[PDB]
Amino acid sequence: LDAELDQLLQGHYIKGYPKQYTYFLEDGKVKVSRPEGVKIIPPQSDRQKIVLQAHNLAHTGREATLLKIANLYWWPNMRKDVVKQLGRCQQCLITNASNKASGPILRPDRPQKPFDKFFIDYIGPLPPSQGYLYVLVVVDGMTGFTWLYPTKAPSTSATVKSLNVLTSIAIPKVIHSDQGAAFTSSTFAEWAKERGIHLEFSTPYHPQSSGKVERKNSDIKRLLTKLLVGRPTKWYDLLPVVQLALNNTYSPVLKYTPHQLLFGIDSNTPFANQDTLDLTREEELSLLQEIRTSLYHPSTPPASSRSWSPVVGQLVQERVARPASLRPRWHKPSTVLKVLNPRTVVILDHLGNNRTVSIDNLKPTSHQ
Amino acid sequence: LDAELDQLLQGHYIKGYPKQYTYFLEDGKVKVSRPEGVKIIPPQSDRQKIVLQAHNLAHTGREATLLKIANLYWWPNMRKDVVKQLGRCQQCLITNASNKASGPILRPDRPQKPFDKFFIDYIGPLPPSQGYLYVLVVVDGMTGFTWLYPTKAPSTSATVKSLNVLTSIAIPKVIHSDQGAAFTSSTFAEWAKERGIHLEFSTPYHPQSSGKVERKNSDIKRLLTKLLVGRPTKWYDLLPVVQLALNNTYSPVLKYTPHQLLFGIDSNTPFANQDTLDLTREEELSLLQEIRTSLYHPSTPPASSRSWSPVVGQLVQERVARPASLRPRWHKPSTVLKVLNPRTVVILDHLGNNRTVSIDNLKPTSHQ
Amino acid sequence: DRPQKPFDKFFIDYIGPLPPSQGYLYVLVVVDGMTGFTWLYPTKAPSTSATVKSLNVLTSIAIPKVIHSDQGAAFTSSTFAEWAKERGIHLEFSTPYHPQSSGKVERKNSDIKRLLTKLLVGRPTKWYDLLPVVQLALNNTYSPVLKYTPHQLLFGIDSNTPFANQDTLDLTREEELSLLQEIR
Amino acid sequence: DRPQKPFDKFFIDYIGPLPPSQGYLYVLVVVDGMTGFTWLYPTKAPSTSATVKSLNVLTSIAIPKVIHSDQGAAFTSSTFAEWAKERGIHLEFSTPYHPQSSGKVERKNSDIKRLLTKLLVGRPTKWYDLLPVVQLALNNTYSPVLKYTPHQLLFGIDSNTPFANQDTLDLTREEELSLLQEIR
DNA sequence: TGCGAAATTCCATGACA
DNA sequence: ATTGTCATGGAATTTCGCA
DNA sequence: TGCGAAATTCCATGACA
DNA sequence: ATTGTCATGGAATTTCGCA
Ligand SMILES: O=C1c2c(ccc(O)c2O)CN1Cc1ccc(F)c(Cl)c1
Ligand SMILES: O=C1c2c(ccc(O)c2O)CN1Cc1ccc(F)c(Cl)c1
Ligand SMILES: [Mg+2]
Ligand SMILES: [Mg+2]
Ligand SMILES: [Mg+2]
Ligand SMILES: [Mg+2]
Ligand SMILES: [Zn+2]
Ligand SMILES: [Zn+2]
């Protein structure tokens, strides 16, 4: 503080204060003639308070804060002190937006077999049709084969009703879903254990994680819409049609329809493919096993020029889910316990719990 | 139809049917042995119906439709006929998404003088504070200097109340706004003509067009939020503080605060810049005129690799604004009357009117 | 002539009436001719209406070229005929009193009747709930003649629920005495 | 010594009581010392409270270094003093009975009084509405001494509303007879 | 006439519901 | 008849202090 | 052994509220 | 304790029919 600054006025060299400028006194304050003009050099014991007053005016970031201070003051390495404050400002940390993108998405391997993995989800509410408001959508991961069930609510009870009917055909190893109330109930848990089905859940608020079914929801809504153009939105009676329509539609990239990947042979639907008419069912099933394994699989896209990837013990913040008006968009900083993969992490959270979250719902805390 | 196909069976050459394959009869239908297998060659008079039946199964696009047909048929230039149908399918045209991006945004010139252009807009509803729910935000285009007025509704009546108070300071040439009810009322129209103010409106549903004020709304909400962290959201009393705070905050790219660009001198606020203490007001105002004209102006970004730009007489479709559940996202095709600029157009619309719309709210009709 | 495939032929038939279970009285039975895969639908009656309702569910998963049945009323109605014509499903009837299917089908249908009987004793009223587990059983049952179960022939993969302890399927001493006593 | 700038000094004073207009009785007058720019705020009383309410509006646009006033009650209260100290606004008083401003200010204040009088005749009750047009007038008025209007000195640009027909500002024969008759 | 470190500028990211 | 914008904080780049 | 045209594949865009 | 996806229709590329 006054030690350093005394030492200075009497021409002696101090580290950080370049020698070529001269450092006088005036109005009882140490000043200096800098190219921009004369600036006060406050004692070190004053600088925290100053940086703070300047920052607090509009809770500004690095440069906008610096520019206010530089109006009156100069001292060695001002931005260091500015950044020190930014990193300690609770209000800035939990309100500002990130300016670093998530790392590139994972393209998880396609389930190996039909019934290996289901992705399930609800669509709705929709215009009431026969007193029904939602649709249970079940999509086989490997094939894309899709089942539709109209429900009155996105409830556990209705999910179980529909899934008992579906699983008469086959029981799946795993059922992946978002954390919707219907799927996270302990009744649904029992229902699954009862059948040796493993329940898999997306990280929270990250529907990309159910992308398989989500994407299929789009096709379902799109096709329903075209079918209802200029009629009252009476969709109940079309679910069966939409189901059959989509299960028998070609994926231009795969060159197969989910029905083909599921059965290896078209059923009696229009335009049925006849290419294996001469093979025995076994030769047919053998060609199907081949087709199945050799399907196009996309790869991780290039990282954007300014992505971040999570690192164990890093300070990161989870996005507030449904933030009230005028309230922060971010939770308080927390620590990365475990890097499950480059897009998924476990963090020790805002209260004191473990949470598995998508990198998409986090920002790295700025200024360390 | 049968003419061409008769002509063919008897070995003679027809244009479109390559000579190296042989074209027999069987079950009363013309067939052909193609590398993939034997396919029926329907008469031309049948092909429209077929393409249609195939397309209608799931209202599929080009390849997915082709693949169904190719299961049974072959003929010359199948995709041409497929595309012919796609372009005529009302339901596909108004329901499908575009897969062509808008052309690169315009960066309009910064208004030359304070008061040349205002951008105005409402924020809210907000948590009730003293019975107030909205905020009128007025932003000077040239300077960014911003006025805030708390209102009970985003109404014409309140807009006029606030703007009478503001325009005691100066009257602006032009006031740009979105098409909100408050600004499009004929009362507001009168109010403006009464004062020689020109009313300028954004194209509809395109808030980017009010980007100046929109962007400032963000800063206002952001700063209010930090100021209200852990207190009840009592924002009424902070408008004045937020106003003053932001009007005196540096834009790191400009190196000026809206207050400086408005007055050329800081008022008695913390950290006031003192650099022109020795100039006369006139030398000061002279330096201000210089600062004003030489401010950084960004340029049009590179077009994305798959943008489209509107062309007079092109078929384009306006986005349905607030589309009901299960209804098309697009209006029927319409024609580009006039290209106002590369991002703005006039179209002859879905009923029979002229409309000025943003390119962002249009897709080019596919298949011509 | 071309080898036999799934969806070539669906054999359908009713079973019932059975004791009321959650409102239902009958079981529509569909068996795929090639694979021996079995679908079961509970109905309130053996009518064209109940048949169409049920077959609508199934035919929204896969459509057979041919449906085969006895000359049951429900299957001979012109409503049912109209329904099938609408879907390019050819209908096929065995002559009255003399029902012919296929060996595989006959035997399947036999298992179905027996396995049902075995479970609607002790709980003659609770079968509605059990129809799914019945189907999985039937469909993961090894076919002596073919190397494979119907699940395997249909989908071309093992099943996540193999029925390893292929069962008695015969009435144990206690069930005989309480089935010859339930029908009292 | 350094040249004079805007926001260096604000001269404030009350005018009233006037005839009720939309509930209001007084006008707080703020004039910038350097520029002669004028702000006007309608109040219901000449109190510290009404002064603070009004000055809060203005001081959220710009803050003067010094406010100058007569020793009006409202300005000498320690509430008003606290208010100014809170904003690092130094307060400054002319000695009682002997009010000193500046020539520019004196003359401005004079125009303000006259122009008001000129419009609150015929409509002595409708002035509240007119305060904005009054200000624009005052602020786009050419200063004989300086080459510029206060708008131009404040903002450094021409105004979109220049007041080209600088007025009589004097009471025409009809107004004399109905002002010496309104105060009847 | 060139070094190491500070200062500045650049700029992608995201939010204005 | 009209049109995106700009605070932000790491990284990239330039400038500075000294020689 | 190379041309013009058709067929195929590629792939950015946008929506799953 | 987990993870984006894929129909779409112009453009880019490969293949085809003929020589
Ligand atoms: O389908 C849902 C859904 C949401 C929230 C909560 C749920 O439980 C949901 O099912 C939002 N959403 C649509 C959506 C939005 C953005 C995307 F990238 C994808 Cl893939 C899907
Ligand atoms: O502020 C408004 C607003 C909207 C609809 C209708 C109005 O009248 C509005 O004022 C949506 N919106 C926020 C918004 C969203 C996306 C953007 F790119 C920008 Cl710039 C701003
Ligand atoms: Mg969901
Ligand atoms: Mg969903
Ligand atoms: Mg608006
Ligand atoms: Mg807005
Ligand atoms: Zn802060
Ligand atoms: Zn269509």
PDB file of C-alpha atoms in Angstrom, chain A residues 158-254:
ATOM      1  CA  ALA A 158     -51.428 -46.323 -19.402  1.00  0.00           C
ATOM      2  CA  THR A 159     -47.801 -47.091 -20.170  1.00  0.00           C
ATOM      3  CA  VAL A 160     -48.105 -50.458 -18.502  1.00  0.00           C
ATOM      4  CA  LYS A 161     -51.412 -51.185 -20.317  1.00  0.00           C
ATOM      5  CA  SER A 162     -49.822 -50.509 -23.740  1.00  0.00           C
ATOM      6  CA  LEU A 163     -46.540 -52.251 -22.959  1.00  0.00           C
ATOM      7  CA  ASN A 164     -48.261 -55.433 -21.807  1.00  0.00           C
ATOM      8  CA  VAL A 165     -49.877 -55.599 -25.219  1.00  0.00           C
ATOM      9  CA  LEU A 166     -46.604 -54.851 -27.032  1.00  0.00           C
ATOM     10  CA  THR A 167     -44.472 -57.273 -25.080  1.00  0.00           C
ATOM     11  CA  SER A 168     -46.788 -60.133 -26.039  1.00  0.00           C
ATOM     12  CA  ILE A 169     -44.702 -60.080 -29.184  1.00  0.00           C
ATOM     13  CA  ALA A 170     -41.295 -60.006 -27.541  1.00  0.00           C
ATOM     14  CA  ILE A 171     -39.644 -58.723 -24.378  1.00  0.00           C
ATOM     15  CA  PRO A 172     -36.865 -56.167 -24.913  1.00  0.00           C
ATOM     16  CA  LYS A 173     -33.542 -56.166 -23.044  1.00  0.00           C
ATOM     17  CA  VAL A 174     -33.666 -52.450 -22.247  1.00  0.00           C
ATOM     18  CA  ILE A 175     -36.170 -49.600 -22.460  1.00  0.00           C
ATOM     19  CA  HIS A 176     -34.622 -46.114 -22.674  1.00  0.00           C
ATOM     20  CA  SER A 177     -36.696 -43.097 -21.798  1.00  0.00           C
ATOM     21  CA  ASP A 178     -36.590 -39.490 -20.618  1.00  0.00           C
ATOM     22  CA  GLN A 179     -37.274 -38.728 -16.959  1.00  0.00           C
ATOM     23  CA  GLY A 180     -40.987 -38.087 -17.496  1.00  0.00           C
ATOM     24  CA  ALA A 181     -43.229 -38.811 -14.494  1.00  0.00           C
ATOM     25  CA  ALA A 182     -44.643 -41.953 -16.224  1.00  0.00           C
ATOM     26  CA  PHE A 183     -41.326 -43.718 -16.522  1.00  0.00           C
ATOM     27  CA  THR A 184     -39.648 -42.800 -13.243  1.00  0.00           C
ATOM     28  CA  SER A 185     -42.489 -44.023 -11.027  1.00  0.00           C
ATOM     29  CA  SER A 186     -41.617 -47.003  -8.861  1.00  0.00           C
ATOM     30  CA  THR A 187     -44.646 -48.815 -10.250  1.00  0.00           C
ATOM     31  CA  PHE A 188     -43.059 -48.731 -13.661  1.00  0.00           C
ATOM     32  CA  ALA A 189     -39.800 -49.844 -12.011  1.00  0.00           C
ATOM     33  CA  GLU A 190     -41.535 -52.962 -10.593  1.00  0.00           C
ATOM     34  CA  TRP A 191     -43.232 -53.626 -13.846  1.00  0.00           C
ATOM     35  CA  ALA A 192     -39.885 -53.803 -15.582  1.00  0.00           C
ATOM     36  CA  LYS A 193     -38.019 -55.868 -12.982  1.00  0.00           C
ATOM     37  CA  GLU A 194     -40.958 -58.277 -13.014  1.00  0.00           C
ATOM     38  CA  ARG A 195     -39.906 -58.974 -16.644  1.00  0.00           C
ATOM     39  CA  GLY A 196     -36.135 -58.754 -16.550  1.00  0.00           C
ATOM     40  CA  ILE A 197     -36.278 -55.484 -18.554  1.00  0.00           C
ATOM     41  CA  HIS A 198     -33.593 -52.919 -17.736  1.00  0.00           C
ATOM     42  CA  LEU A 199     -34.724 -49.291 -17.411  1.00  0.00           C
ATOM     43  CA  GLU A 200     -32.396 -46.739 -18.998  1.00  0.00           C
ATOM     44  CA  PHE A 201     -32.869 -42.992 -18.506  1.00  0.00           C
ATOM     45  CA  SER A 202     -31.713 -39.929 -20.436  1.00  0.00           C
ATOM     46  CA  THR A 203     -29.836 -37.290 -18.467  1.00  0.00           C
ATOM     47  CA  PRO A 204     -32.385 -34.676 -17.411  1.00  0.00           C
ATOM     48  CA  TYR A 205     -33.815 -32.108 -19.842  1.00  0.00           C
ATOM     49  CA  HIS A 206     -31.975 -33.562 -22.838  1.00  0.00           C
ATOM     50  CA  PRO A 207     -34.374 -35.023 -25.361  1.00  0.00           C
ATOM     51  CA  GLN A 208     -31.549 -35.451 -27.912  1.00  0.00           C
ATOM     52  CA  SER A 209     -30.775 -38.450 -25.683  1.00  0.00           C
ATOM     53  CA  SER A 210     -34.048 -40.053 -26.786  1.00  0.00           C
ATOM     54  CA  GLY A 211     -33.317 -38.798 -30.330  1.00  0.00           C
ATOM     55  CA  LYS A 212     -34.379 -42.146 -31.836  1.00  0.00           C
ATOM     56  CA  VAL A 213     -38.012 -41.849 -30.705  1.00  0.00           C
ATOM     57  CA  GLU A 214     -37.991 -38.063 -30.697  1.00  0.00           C
ATOM     58  CA  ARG A 215     -37.117 -38.043 -34.336  1.00  0.00           C
ATOM     59  CA  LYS A 216     -39.809 -40.562 -35.049  1.00  0.00           C
ATOM     60  CA  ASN A 217     -42.378 -38.378 -33.250  1.00  0.00           C
ATOM     61  CA  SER A 218     -41.640 -35.794 -35.926  1.00  0.00           C
ATOM     62  CA  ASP A 219     -42.453 -38.202 -38.744  1.00  0.00           C
ATOM     63  CA  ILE A 220     -45.658 -39.248 -36.914  1.00  0.00           C
ATOM     64  CA  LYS A 221     -46.890 -35.654 -36.450  1.00  0.00           C
ATOM     65  CA  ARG A 222     -45.853 -34.748 -39.998  1.00  0.00           C
ATOM     66  CA  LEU A 223     -47.774 -37.637 -41.546  1.00  0.00           C
ATOM     67  CA  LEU A 224     -50.853 -37.085 -39.330  1.00  0.00           C
ATOM     68  CA  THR A 225     -50.864 -33.470 -40.378  1.00  0.00           C
ATOM     69  CA  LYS A 226     -50.902 -34.210 -44.112  1.00  0.00           C
ATOM     70  CA  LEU A 227     -53.601 -36.787 -43.575  1.00  0.00           C
ATOM     71  CA  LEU A 228     -55.731 -34.307 -41.684  1.00  0.00           C
ATOM     72  CA  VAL A 229     -55.327 -31.334 -44.111  1.00  0.00           C
ATOM     73  CA  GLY A 230     -58.756 -29.702 -44.323  1.00  0.00           C
ATOM     74  CA  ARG A 231     -60.527 -32.233 -42.079  1.00  0.00           C
ATOM     75  CA  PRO A 232     -61.259 -31.974 -38.378  1.00  0.00           C
ATOM     76  CA  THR A 233     -58.213 -33.264 -36.457  1.00  0.00           C
ATOM     77  CA  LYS A 234     -59.642 -36.706 -35.806  1.00  0.00           C
ATOM     78  CA  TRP A 235     -56.306 -38.552 -35.318  1.00  0.00           C
ATOM     79  CA  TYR A 236     -57.386 -41.478 -33.161  1.00  0.00           C
ATOM     80  CA  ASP A 237     -58.528 -43.502 -36.149  1.00  0.00           C
ATOM     81  CA  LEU A 238     -55.345 -42.832 -38.047  1.00  0.00           C
ATOM     82  CA  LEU A 239     -52.765 -44.092 -35.565  1.00  0.00           C
ATOM     83  CA  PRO A 240     -52.988 -47.627 -37.050  1.00  0.00           C
ATOM     84  CA  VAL A 241     -52.590 -46.241 -40.595  1.00  0.00           C
ATOM     85  CA  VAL A 242     -49.687 -44.008 -39.607  1.00  0.00           C
ATOM     86  CA  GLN A 243     -47.994 -46.914 -37.818  1.00  0.00           C
ATOM     87  CA  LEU A 244     -48.236 -49.219 -40.807  1.00  0.00           C
ATOM     88  CA  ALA A 245     -47.314 -46.405 -43.210  1.00  0.00           C
ATOM     89  CA  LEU A 246     -44.100 -45.451 -41.425  1.00  0.00           C
ATOM     90  CA  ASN A 247     -42.996 -48.970 -40.545  1.00  0.00           C
ATOM     91  CA  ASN A 248     -43.079 -49.671 -44.250  1.00  0.00           C
ATOM     92  CA  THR A 249     -41.304 -46.503 -45.480  1.00  0.00           C
ATOM     93  CA  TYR A 250     -37.743 -46.539 -46.856  1.00  0.00           C
ATOM     94  CA  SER A 251     -34.872 -44.751 -45.174  1.00  0.00           C
ATOM     95  CA  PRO A 252     -33.049 -43.420 -48.203  1.00  0.00           C
ATOM     96  CA  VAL A 253     -29.671 -43.778 -46.494  1.00  0.00           C
ATOM     97  CA  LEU A 254     -30.230 -47.337 -45.311  1.00  0.00           C
TER      98      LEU A 254
END
